[PDB]
Amino acid sequence: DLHYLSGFGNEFASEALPGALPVGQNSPQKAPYGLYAELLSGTAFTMARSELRRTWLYRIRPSALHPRFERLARQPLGGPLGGINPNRLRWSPQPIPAEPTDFIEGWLPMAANAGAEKPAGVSIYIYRANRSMERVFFNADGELLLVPEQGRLRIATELGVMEVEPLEIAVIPRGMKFRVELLDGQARGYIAENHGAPLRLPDLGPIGSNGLANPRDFLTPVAHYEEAEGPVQLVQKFLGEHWACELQHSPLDVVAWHGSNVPYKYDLRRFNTIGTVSFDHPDPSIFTVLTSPTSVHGMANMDFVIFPPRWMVAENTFRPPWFHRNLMNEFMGLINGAYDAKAEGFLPGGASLHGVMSAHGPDAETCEKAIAADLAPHKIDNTMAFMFETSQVLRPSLQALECPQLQADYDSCWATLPSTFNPNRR
């Protein structure tokens, strides 16, 4: 099977041929095997070492060997920004379109902080694919966080091949070349496109030096190169547009590499979930897998949080999520099973958006159940929900608002919430 290197943020080193990596230097005059040294600077040169993301590649042909890029006619992301809407929104799962749509062609824009033409913050999509990619792609607009829901993915990147299935997540750095093979014929899932500071592990605070997503579970592929003599289309996403050129070699021609700006996968089943071992309901930030910070300490660009199988032990407490109003913007998804807060309507591939200060919380069915529950240890199982929480307002696209999937009467799930107040009895 495919091999991997472990350790989030490590200075990795990988060669497909022995001695392909130069020893004791980055730029020899005549590189082993007659390879070309190339530097991929994922961060500004002057970043603190802790923030540094850079990889040295030793390849057959320089990435510079390409003709002029031309705008393609076929622009999945060229749709308008939907009109202003403060309502709580919920979508049913997205159907796979009948027309041939590969991985890059199938990104349906759901909600974003800014227009595709001026990338800032986070852009959220749902991908629907029915074709494997017969081209190579790189995103100039940001880091890609992939959340499969339906079907396995075999992702051929410049640094190696990774296999990603639902219940796992994968990250592609900005500008890195990749090609998506659909192993099950069709694929559906979620994407967080990070335009900001790279995703990293959260500051654990009192949790200390261990817990949540343990760095040892972040897997990076080993060196792997191709040698195809012939035309291969290279596509790039630039300011929301797809631009392409034809190469006469495969751009996945990296024989060896070393550095820290790498693609990676992580299995969510390995999450060391922390929670209440006493009473009350911890803030959902406790379930943080990865985070993208801003220059405002403590206020993330986005937080990727999961709602995984876990033990529920809170005594004399209302166990489902509390009623909530938040400065932050809450985009919810579902990979497997059902979510603890919504009795009906939220299915795998579905989505919910509770924007800035929009009043949310449990439905009446969940409320009645929880207040009547005989509280004893209970293990939540066979489920995996997640949230992409952003600091900037998420603006739904015109496409997601005109979407047949956008539920018509979502507000009705809270309509049957009764008054239980009696001032004459504490």
Ligand X SMILES: O=C(O)Cc1cc(O)ccc1O
Ligand Y SMILES: O=C1C=C[C@H](O)C(CC(=O)O)=C1
The interface with ligand X within residues 259-318 (CB under 6 A) comprises 284
User: Among all residues, which ones are annotated catalytic?
Assistant: 281
Q: For residue 130, how many C-alpha atoms fall within 13 Å in the half-sphere facing its CB?
A: 7
299 binds its own copies (CB under 8 A): yes
Q: Cβ of residue 72: shortest distance to ligand X, in angstroms?
A: 27
| 309 sits near ligand Y (criterion: CB under 6 A) | no
CA distances for 116 relative to 48, 76, 103, 245, 382, angstroms:
30, 11, 18, 21, 36
The one-letter code for the residue type at 179 is: R
Closest to ligand Y by CB, 332 or 400: 332
Round the CA-based radius of gyration of the chain to a whole number and report it.
23
Does 396 engage in binding with ligand X (CB under 6 A)?
no
Ligand-binding annotation for 324, yes or no, is yes
Residue 374 CB, shortest distance to Fe ion, in Å, is 27
Binds 341: which of its own copies, ligand Y, Fe ion, none (CB < 5-8 Å by kind): ligand Y
Residue among 368, 370, 214, 360 nearest 284 (CA): 360
Any binding-site annotation on 264? no
Backbone angles phi, psi at 363, to 5 degrees: -80, 175
Burial of 35 per CB tally in 10 Å (0-12, 13-18, 19+):
buried
**What does the DSSP 8-state code read for residue 372?**
H
Q: Taking CB under 8 A as the criterion, which residues in 42-81 touch its own copies?
A: 42-52, 54, 60-69, 71
Burial of 249 (0-12, 13-18, 19+ CB in 10 A): middle
Q: Decide: is 324 part of the binding site for ligand Y (CB under 6 A).
A: yes
Restricting to residues 387-406, name those near its own copies by CB under 8 A.
391, 393
Residue 175 binds its own copies (CB under 8 A)? yes
By Cβ distance, which residue is nearest to ligand X? Answer: 321
- Shortest gap between Cβ of 7 and its own copies (angstroms)? 4
Q: Can you give the length of the chain in residues?
A: 426
The arrangement of strands across the sheet holding 288-292 comes to 89-91, 351-354, 329-336, 384-390, 302-307, 288-292
Identified binder of ligand X from the candidate list 324, 369, 373, 417, rule CB under 6 A: 324
Piece in contact with ligand Y (CB under 6 A), picked from 71-79, 295-303, 324-332, 411-419: 324-332
What is the rounded CA–CA span in Å between residue 160 and residue 36?
Answer: 17
- The residue (of 174 and 360) whose beta carbon lies closer to ligand X is 360
Tell me the sheet residues that pair with 391: none
Q: Which token pair is 321?
A: 């999520």
Rule CB under 8 A: is residue 9 a binding residue for its own copies?
Answer: yes
Shortest reach from residue 175's CB to Fe ion, in Å: 12
Binds its own copies (CB under 8 A): choice among 136, 145, 164, 328: 328
Q: Which of 146, 172, 341, 394 binds ligand Y (CB under 6 A)?
A: 341
Nearer to ligand X, 9 or 284 (CB): 284
Distance CA 240, CA 242 (A): 7
Q: Which of ligand Y, its own copies, ligand X, none is residue 72 near (CB under 5 to 8 Å by kind)? A: none
Are the CB atoms for 287 and 389 separated by under 8 Å? no
List, in order, residues 6 or more apart from 73 with CB less than 8 Å away. Answer: none
Count of residues engaged in binding ligand Y, rule: CB under 6 A: 7
Contact set with Fe ion (CB under 5 A): 324, 326
Does 330 appear as a known binding residue? yes
Comparing CA positions, the residue from 210, 185, 65 lying closest to residue 128 is 185
Q: Does 334 bind ligand Y (CB under 6 A)?
A: no
319 binds ligand X (CB under 6 A): no
- Work out how close the CB of 389 gets to Fe ion at its nearest, in angstroms, rounded to a whole number: 8
Bridge partners of residue 171, in order along the sequence? 145, 264
What amino acid occupies position 143?
A: E
Smallest gap from residue 54 Cβ to its own copies (A): 5
Q: E strands within 118-186? A: 122-129, 136-139, 143-150, 153-157, 160-164, 168-172, 178-182
The binder of 10, among its own copies, ligand Y, Fe ion, none, by C-beta within 5 to 8 A per type, is: its own copies
Instruction: Give yes or no for residue 216 binding its own copies (CB under 8 A).
Output: yes
Residues closing a segment before a gap in the chain (C–N exceeding 2.5 Å): none
Q: How many residues bind its own copies, per CB under 8 A?
A: 161
Closest separation in Å from C-beta 75 to its own copies: 11
Residue type, 112: A
Hey, what are 300's tokens? 């993330």
Binding-site entries for Fe cation: 324, 330, 360
User: Which residues here bind ligand X, judged by CB under 6 A?
Assistant: 284, 321, 324, 330, 332, 341, 360
Q: Please report, in range form, the residues annotated as the binding site for homogentisate.
A: 339, 360
Annotated binding site: 324, 330, 339, 360
